[PDB]
């Protein structure tokens, strides 16, 4: 039944029944929701799961990505390595205020409400320090 629900999502992209998702199908569904990816961003996204290298996503590749999410060990390690960039002490901790600065000032910045929900979800200590390795296991569970 989980496979059938993935198939129904896959068919929203591949409305023609061709069994593939190209940049046209992916980007069309995304822009209908009000997103505006570039062509190079749509190519990068498809390339992450396109083993055949022909610029498409087929259902086996789609199902694999959906079943896996972030649960794999590669994801847990890399996310933990990203936090460690901002942990100079090396003790596995990061300050709530330092997490807030990085999340709202670097990269694809989180909004205030996004970052508020993120700090609420981490079981912050009374000092104001966050143990990010248990934060990584909650996102990889």
């Amino acid at each position: 039944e989980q496979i059938a629900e993935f198939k129904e999502a896959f068919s929203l992209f591949d409305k023609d029944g061709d069994g593939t998702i190209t940049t046209k199908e992916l980007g069309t569904v995304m822009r209908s929701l009000g997103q505006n990816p570039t062509e190079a961003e749509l190519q990068d996204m498809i390339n992450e799961v396109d083993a055949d290298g022909n610029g498409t996503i087929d259902f086996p590749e789609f199902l694999t990505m959906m079943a896996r999410k972030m649960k794999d060990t590669d994801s847990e390690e890399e996310i933990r390595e990203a936090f460690r960039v901002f942990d100079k002490d090396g003790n596995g901790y990061i300050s709530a205020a330092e997490l807030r600065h990085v999340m709202t000032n670097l990269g694809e910045k989180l909004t205030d409400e996004e970052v508020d929900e993120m700090i609420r979800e981490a079981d912050i200590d009374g000092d104001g320090q966050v143990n990010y390795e248990e934060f990584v296991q909650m996102m990889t569970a």
Partner: peptide, 18 residues
């Protein structure tokens, strides 16, 4: 040069989780 790449990864992971 993993400053911004590392920072963006945590954000995409949080957005997916949420």
């Amino acid at each position: 040069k993993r400053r911004m790449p590392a920072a963006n990864l945590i954000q995409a992971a949080w957005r997916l989780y949420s």
